[PDB]
Design a protein around this ligand. Structure first.
Ligand SMILES: Cc1cc2c(cc1C)N(C[C@H](O)[C@H](O)[C@H](O)COP(=O)(O)OP(=O)(O)OC[C@H]1O[C@@H](n3cnc4c(N)ncnc43)[C@H](O)[C@@H]1O)c1[nH]c(=O)[nH]c(=O)c1N2
Ligand SMILES: Cc1cc2c(cc1C)N(C[C@H](O)[C@H](O)[C@H](O)COP(=O)(O)OP(=O)(O)OC[C@H]1O[C@@H](n3cnc4c(N)ncnc43)[C@H](O)[C@@H]1O)c1[nH]c(=O)[nH]c(=O)c1N2
Ligand SMILES: CN1CCC=C1c1cccnc1
Lengths: 432, 432
């Protein structure tokens, strides 16, 4: 006889999918989002008169769960084509900048990536069962750098692939779990071209927030915003949920979809299992930030990688024209390498790559400083993948979702949707 | 004020998915199945002490819609013994058998398939928008054989790829549309290994009928069996449905999911659009059958192609052991090439492929003789794909689904589920 059948904590894709499932099963469903907005680690905004993406945005048809949702709600794709590049750059750890032919750049990144993932089929014949093979468990003792060191790459190739893997980690590659990379590669059909097609090619028609709103409208759930959850208590065959306004909401079941790195901010009674607490203390690796830079010059279509000891790890032209100048889209692997809110430091770092340009504006999202993400995309450290079930496992009447908890595309919208579907099923099993 | 909000004609995957979508939206939903069983062109049965699939059986995680359903209902995969093969054979049109080392066999089929689909990337960059490129439309004037004739393949390679394509066509390859094959290959990540992994490697835990029953139970719809629909009339802002007896059912909308080849047996008032009538007159090509053979000997893990003038076109091990012997799963492209219900002829042909074996049992399903399939899986003839919209288009309050009508994995369970999701969306738009 509680206030709700199910309470979903978190308004990202995982929470929205869980809420849709529970609502269409007829449960009285409430969703609590801590921010004043939905989307979580997806966030569409505007800068310098244009639309920009501060978080995740890109999807693909090889990603099963989000593609099935797009079919359900009749959403197509929007191509970010990019076409030919006018300038490809690599910045080594020592700060030196080298201009390379786009063709040679692509050839070298392909050689390095295919060497890194040469054994994806043998290790992950079932990418959605990461622990299927013993080889996966054995390789979860190795870092991405451990493998890179064995590949006999050239200096250029090594710098390129290390920059790429530091981006995927949001951290230095010596800490990055190797098997998660192989597993993502395998999810893309064990093939370089197919996987690369998923990276930054297609966005959702009507936007991530469009799909989230469609799901939440379909769900019929009550949706309360700016209501952060601070504690969960299991009692009376149910749960009590406290907000930061000391309010109490009771329910038969609760689905947690908050990012792993934020669990520290929530009290649980009874305490969570030891394995879950190990995960909660560890966190996930990524410390990334996103930055858009409006410069006066028209630099055309540019792309640059910077290795892990430098700040501007992924740079690419968002838009360009003589009147506009250029908007640069920049992903920073580790926030600590640059103060994105300092225009003089940002300008110095940008000019290191593009001499003489004048910075007209900046717009940044520091995902590590946001208390409701405390980090960016999901990136497993060494040894974490093989314990992932400890995080996925239900704890009585508390269920757990989120992209970190997915088996497939765990650094993506698709993994969040997967975890939401699973959480819906688990709610149905508990409530019948 | 009709008897139901929505009536779904057909108890296959498309109908079950449409019924699940409609039921979870709260519509009063009825499902009419003409057979005494559910599953349609999937059929879970038993043979030689084991569970078998007489129709569609194999799925994959690169198939978005059915994989998402499997996640929703908590179903894993069941691996058939395709890896590490002990014997790979080719039987040419003349009946001669050539045994090849499994690696050489796989290498040659890969060479032939990727040569056939060398331009899949350029022609189908968006496999779920088949008419996206002009090249796809222009190639829809060509047959699979038209291209095979340009490839200069070796004898083994040509026989392998022609057997594969005659199986997928259910017909001789001179009639098989080229673009649909390129499009399926593209759906499989544009590479042979990944595509082949999606076709005959993994089955559903608990069976196709397990997933069908899960969806239909979730839907809450009424399910009436042995009720064939003979006519549909649009009247009074709804539709009237006549059965084979004196029953009449009124509804706000009806979703037709019966196989294309059976529409000839159904009257429509008003008559359907000219394009849809053209499709209904043409039909689709497939004349396939399925056959399971239990032999006393333990053959291990076997795989064989037979070209189109022979009956045992696709052979692979279902199960094997010293006590059991072997169960062979055999897919026949054209029923007319063998009397699957005559066990002595089946034994003769099996021994033609595997000399000296002793046949303990046979179990077959002739999909072309069933009046409610009149053919097998979906196989497009020349020129049909570029007109597929004519088949997809709603006709007032009648909606059309089924694997033939899907955009992606159209020869598969996944395409059926896709069409069911689409039909759900269209019903929601019509009824609100
Ligand atoms: C910069 C950047 C770039 C990318 C990506 C991420 C980022 C940060 N990703 C990943 C993608 O954005 C991500 O994997 C999913 O959006 C994760 O969504 P979840 O629902 O799992 O968590 P998410 O963080 O979205 O949802 C959690 C929700 O819970 C809320 N919350 C937290 N604590 C709470 C509390 N105590 N009480 C209540 N609510 C609370 C949060 O505010 C948030 O709304 C991506 N993906 C992709 O597919 N393509 C891409 O290109 C990228 N690139
Ligand atoms: C032997 C064989 C083998 C394979 C496959 C098919 C076959 C026949 N396929 C293809 C796959 O099985 C197929 O494409 C879909 O399951 C078709 O499902 P639909 O719902 O579109 O039609 P399907 O034919 O399944 O459903 C239509 C339903 O409508 C009913 N019906 C017909 N007329 C009616 C009437 N007048 N009134 C009422 N009901 C009526 C039928 O009885 C049937 O139940 C496959 N796929 C895959 O993914 N993996 C595989 O391995 C294979 N292999
Ligand atoms: C996997 N699909 C879909 C259409 C027909 C097949 C098939 C392939 C090989 C053997 N039997 C059936």
């Amino acid at each position: 006889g509680f206030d709700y059948d199910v309470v979903v904590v978190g308004g990202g894709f995982a929470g929205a999918t869980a809420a849709r499932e529970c609502g269409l099963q007829g449960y009285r469903t409430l969703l609590l989002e801590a921010r004043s907005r939905l989307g979580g680690r997806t966030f569409t905004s505007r800068f310098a008169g244009q639309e920009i993406e501060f978080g995740g945005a890109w999807v693909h048809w090889l990603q099963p769960h989000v593609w099935a949702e797009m079919q359900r709600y009749g959403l197509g794709v929007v191509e970010d084509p990019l076409t030919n590049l006018d300038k490809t750059l690599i910045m080594y750890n020592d700060g030196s900048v080298e201009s390379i032919s786009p063709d040679e750049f692509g050839k070298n990144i392909r050689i390095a990536f295919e060497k890194l993932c040469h054994d994806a089929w043998e290790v992950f014949p079932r990418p959605h069962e990461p622990m299927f093979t013993e080889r996966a468990r054995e390789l979860d003792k190795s870092s991405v750098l451990d493998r890179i060191k064995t590949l006999g790459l050239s200096r250029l190739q090594q710098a390129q692939i290390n920059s790429y893997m530091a981006l995927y980690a949001g951290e230095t590659t010596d800490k990055f779990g190797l098997p998660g990379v192989l597993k993502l590669f395998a999810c893309g059909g064990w093939n370089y071209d197919a996987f690369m097609d998923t990276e930054t090619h297609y966005r959702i028609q009507g936007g991530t927030i469009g799909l989230i709103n469609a799901m939440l409208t379909d769900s019929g759930a009550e949706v309360r915003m700016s209501v952060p959850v601070t504690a969960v208590e299991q009692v009376n065959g149910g749960v009590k949920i406290k907000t930061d306004d000391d309010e109490i909401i009771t329910a038969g079941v609760v689905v947690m979809t908050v990012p792993l790195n934020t669990y520290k901010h929530i009290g649980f009674t009874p305490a969570l299992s030891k394995g879950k607490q190990r995960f909660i203390k560890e966190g996930q690796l990524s410390k990334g930030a996103k930055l858009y830079v409006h410069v006066k010059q028209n630099l055309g279509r540019v792309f640059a990688f910077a290795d892990e000891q430098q700040p501007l790890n992924w740079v690419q032209t968002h838009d360009y024209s003589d009147e506009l100048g250029t908007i640069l889209s920049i992903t920073i692997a580790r926030k600590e390498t640059i103060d994105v809110n300092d225009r003089d430091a940002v300008t110095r770092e940008v000019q290191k790559m593009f001499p003489g340009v004048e910075v007209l504006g900046t717009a940044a999202y520091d995902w590590t400083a946001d208390p409701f993400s405390l980090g960016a995309w999901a990136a497993y450290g060494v040894g974490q993948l093989s314990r992932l079930k400890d995080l996925q496992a239900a704890e009585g009447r508390i269920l757990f979702a989120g992209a970190e908890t997915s088996n497939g595309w765990h650094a993506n919208i698709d993994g969040a949707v997967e975890s939401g579907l699973r959480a819906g099923r688990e709610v149905k099993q508990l409530l019948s």
